Scaffold this active site. Structure first.
Site, PDB file in Angstrom:
ATOM      1  N   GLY A  55       0.538   5.833   0.287  1.00  0.00           N
ATOM      2  CA  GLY A  55      -0.157   7.123   0.314  1.00  0.00           C
ATOM      3  C   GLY A  55       0.644   8.239   0.979  1.00  0.00           C
ATOM      4  O   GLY A  55       1.823   8.440   0.661  1.00  0.00           O
ATOM      5  N   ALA A  56       0.001   8.947   1.911  1.00  0.00           N
ATOM      6  CA  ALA A  56       0.542  10.185   2.502  1.00  0.00           C
ATOM      7  C   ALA A  56       1.821   9.958   3.307  1.00  0.00           C
ATOM      8  O   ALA A  56       2.850  10.582   3.028  1.00  0.00           O
ATOM      9  CB  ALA A  56      -0.519  10.856   3.388  1.00  0.00           C
ATOM     10  N   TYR A  57       1.723   9.088   4.317  1.00  0.00           N
ATOM     11  CA  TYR A  57       2.859   8.657   5.170  1.00  0.00           C
ATOM     12  C   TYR A  57       4.080   8.217   4.351  1.00  0.00           C
ATOM     13  O   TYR A  57       5.229   8.490   4.724  1.00  0.00           O
ATOM     14  CB  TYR A  57       2.422   7.495   6.091  1.00  0.00           C
ATOM     15  CG  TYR A  57       1.901   6.286   5.323  1.00  0.00           C
ATOM     16  CD1 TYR A  57       2.752   5.235   4.978  1.00  0.00           C
ATOM     17  CD2 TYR A  57       0.568   6.216   4.900  1.00  0.00           C
ATOM     18  CE1 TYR A  57       2.288   4.142   4.254  1.00  0.00           C
ATOM     19  CE2 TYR A  57       0.097   5.124   4.176  1.00  0.00           C
ATOM     20  CZ  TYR A  57       0.962   4.088   3.858  1.00  0.00           C
ATOM     21  OH  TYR A  57       0.512   3.003   3.137  1.00  0.00           O
ATOM     22  N   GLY A  58       3.813   7.539   3.236  1.00  0.00           N
ATOM     23  CA  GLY A  58       4.840   6.890   2.434  1.00  0.00           C
ATOM     24  C   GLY A  58       4.284   5.608   1.837  1.00  0.00           C
ATOM     25  O   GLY A  58       3.349   5.647   1.033  1.00  0.00           O
TER      26      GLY A  58
ATOM     27  N   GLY B 193       0.838  -1.194   0.000  1.00  0.00           N
ATOM     28  CA  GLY B 193       0.000   0.000   0.000  1.00  0.00           C
ATOM     29  C   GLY B 193       0.870   1.240   0.000  1.00  0.00           C
ATOM     30  O   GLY B 193       2.045   1.172   0.363  1.00  0.00           O
TER      31      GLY B 193
ATOM     32  N   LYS C 192       6.595  -0.559   7.074  1.00  0.00           N
ATOM     33  CA  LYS C 192       6.063   0.769   6.775  1.00  0.00           C
ATOM     34  C   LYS C 192       7.231   1.731   6.769  1.00  0.00           C
ATOM     35  O   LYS C 192       7.951   1.858   7.762  1.00  0.00           O
ATOM     36  CB  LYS C 192       5.022   1.188   7.816  1.00  0.00           C
ATOM     37  CG  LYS C 192       4.275   2.481   7.541  1.00  0.00           C
ATOM     38  CD  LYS C 192       3.106   2.597   8.545  1.00  0.00           C
ATOM     39  CE  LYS C 192       2.060   3.588   8.141  1.00  0.00           C
ATOM     40  NZ  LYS C 192       0.856   3.445   9.022  1.00  0.00           N
TER      41      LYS C 192
ATOM     42  N   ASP D 264     -10.504   5.927  12.766  1.00  0.00           N
ATOM     43  CA  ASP D 264     -10.644   5.797  11.308  1.00  0.00           C
ATOM     44  C   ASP D 264     -10.914   4.360  10.899  1.00  0.00           C
ATOM     45  O   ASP D 264     -10.295   3.835   9.973  1.00  0.00           O
ATOM     46  CB  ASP D 264      -9.403   6.362  10.577  1.00  0.00           C
ATOM     47  CG  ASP D 264      -9.689   6.761   9.110  1.00  0.00           C
ATOM     48  OD1 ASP D 264      -8.720   6.911   8.334  1.00  0.00           O
ATOM     49  OD2 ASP D 264     -10.868   6.946   8.723  1.00  0.00           O
TER      50      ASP D 264
HETATM   51  C1  LIG Z   1      -2.328  -5.396   1.777  1.00  0.00           C
HETATM   52  C2  LIG Z   1      -1.664  -5.079   3.062  1.00  0.00           C
HETATM   53  C3  LIG Z   1      -1.170  -6.052   3.835  1.00  0.00           C
HETATM   54  C4  LIG Z   1      -0.543  -5.637   5.114  1.00  0.00           C
HETATM   55  N1  LIG Z   1      -0.075  -6.461   6.008  1.00  0.00           N
HETATM   56  N2  LIG Z   1       0.404  -5.740   7.070  1.00  0.00           N
HETATM   57  C5  LIG Z   1       0.236  -4.416   6.830  1.00  0.00           C
HETATM   58  O1  LIG Z   1       0.515  -3.412   7.471  1.00  0.00           O
HETATM   59  N3  LIG Z   1      -0.434  -4.402   5.449  1.00  0.00           N
HETATM   60  C6  LIG Z   1      -0.912  -3.345   4.644  1.00  0.00           C
HETATM   61  C7  LIG Z   1      -0.781  -2.032   5.042  1.00  0.00           C
HETATM   62  C8  LIG Z   1      -1.264  -1.019   4.239  1.00  0.00           C
HETATM   63  C9  LIG Z   1      -1.879  -1.325   3.053  1.00  0.00           C
HETATM   64  C10 LIG Z   1      -2.014  -2.645   2.666  1.00  0.00           C
HETATM   65  C11 LIG Z   1      -1.532  -3.671   3.460  1.00  0.00           C
END
Ligand SMILES: Cc1cc2n[nH]c(=O)n2c2ccccc12
Length: 279
Positions: A17-20, A15, A37, A129
Site C-alpha cells: 500500500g502507501a508505505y510501499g 501486502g 518491509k 489502528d
Molecule cells: C500476510 C502477511 C504476513 C506478514 N508476516 N509478517 C508481516 O509483517 N506480514 C504482513 C504484513 C503486511 C501485510 C501482510 C502480511
C-alpha cells in the site's frame, strides 16, 4: 563466518500500500523465512521522519503477541525493516462474512489481543489502528499485532500525554475522536478491540462510524440488540460488548476489568489437538 548467510531471496508479496510493500524473504543458506518491509522514502516528504518513528517504536517492543522486529537496513532512500513472518496470514481472512467464527476461537484470539495491548500500554505505546488487517497469525494461530506506522508514545516518565490527532479507521475508531479535541489514548484502543470482537463473532461491522448521524450507532445506544450484528452474538460476550462500546470513554471498561469479565473467563476452547493412539 559462513558465506551467503546474509543473503535473502524475495519470493512473494505479502501486502502492499502507501508505505510501499512487505515481501516474504527466505535465507539463501538456512531457508529461514522473515517478512521484509520495503519503504521508498522519496514517495512522500514526511516519509523519512514517519518511517524513523516506526523503527524507533519497533526497537522498544518484545512480546509474543507483537510482530517481532529483527532490525533494519538503509540503502540510499530505501528502508528495509526485517519483521517476524506470520504464515497464517491476517485475522481478517478468518472472519467469514455474515458468520464470523466459532466463539471459542474468537475468545482465544481476544485473550491474545488483550495480552498484546496490555503489553503495549504497559510500556506507554498506543497502536491507534487496531483492526483485523493489522492482526497477523503464526503457524500455530498465535495472534501478533502488526504495523506501528500510526503508533505513538502516550506515557513517558510516568506522565500521560493526552492525544488530539484524528487517525485510525472509521468503523473501528472511538466516538471521542469525532467529538472531542483531546482524549485519553487507552480507551481508544479498548474500543477498537471491541469492534474487532464484534467482527469475529458476527462477520460484520456494526456501523460506518460512531456518530449519532449513523442510524446503526444510534440503535446501539438505544439498546436495540434484537438487530444485527448483536442478535448473532450470545448473551455472555454481548454483555462484555455492552461494557466496551460505551460512548463515554471515562465510563468505558478498562483492560484490568475486561480480564475479570464473566465471558472472558468462561472455559470454551480446547487446546490444540495432539497426536494420540489407543490400545
Ligand atoms: C500476510 C502477511 C504476513 C506478514 N508476516 N509478517 C508481516 O509483517 N506480514 C504482513 C504484513 C503486511 C501485510 C501482510 C502480511
Amino acid at each position: 563466518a559462513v558465506p551467503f548467510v546474509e543473503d535473502w531471496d524475495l519470493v512473494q508479496t505479502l501486502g502492499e500500500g502507501a508505505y510501499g510493500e512487505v515481501q516474504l524473504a527466505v535465507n539463501r543458506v538456512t531457508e529461514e523465512a522473515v517478512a521484509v518491509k520495503i519503504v521508498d522514502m522519496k514517495r512522500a516528504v514526511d516519509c523519512p521522519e514517519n518511517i524513523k518513528k516506526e523503527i524507533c517504536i519497533n526497537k522498544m517492543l518484545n512480546h509474543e503477541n507483537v510482530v517481532k522486529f529483527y532490525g533494519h537496513r538503509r540503502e540510499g532512500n530505501i528502508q528495509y525493516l526485517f519483521l517476524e513472518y506470520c504464515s497464517g496470514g491476517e485475522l481478517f481472512d478468518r472472519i467469514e462474512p455474515d458468520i464470523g467464527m466459532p466463539e471459542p476461537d474468537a475468545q482465544r484470539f481476544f485473550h491474545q489481543l488483550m495480552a498484546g495491548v496490555v503489553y503495549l500500554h504497559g510500556i506507554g505505546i498506543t497502536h491507534r489502528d487496531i483492526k483485523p488487517e493489522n492482526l497477523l497469525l503464526d503457524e500455530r494461530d498465535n495472534l501478533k499485532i502488526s504495523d506501528f506506522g500510526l503508533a505513538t508514545v502516550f506515557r513517558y516518565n510516568n506522565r500521560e500525554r493526552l492525544l488530539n490527532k484524528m487517525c485510525g479507521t472509521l468503523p473501528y475508531v472511538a466516538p471521542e475522536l469525532l467529538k472531542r479535541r483531546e482524549f485519553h489514548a487507552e480507551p481508544v484502543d479498548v474500543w477498537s478491540c471491541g469492534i474487532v470482537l464484534t467482527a469475529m463473532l458476527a462477520g460484520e461491522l456494526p456501523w460506518d462510524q460512531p456518530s449519532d448521524s449513523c442510524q446503526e450507532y444510534s440503535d446501539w445506544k438505544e439498546k436495540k440488540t434484537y438487530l444485527n450484528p448483536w442478535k448473532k452474538i450470545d448473551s455472555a460476550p454481548l454483555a462484555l460488548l455492552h461494557k466496551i462500546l460505551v460512548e463515554n470513554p471515562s465510563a468505558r471498561i478498562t483492560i484490568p476489568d475486561i480480564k475479570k469479565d464473566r465471558w472472558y473467563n468462561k472455559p470454551l476452547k480446547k487446546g490444540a489437538k495432539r497426536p494420540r493412539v489407543t490400545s
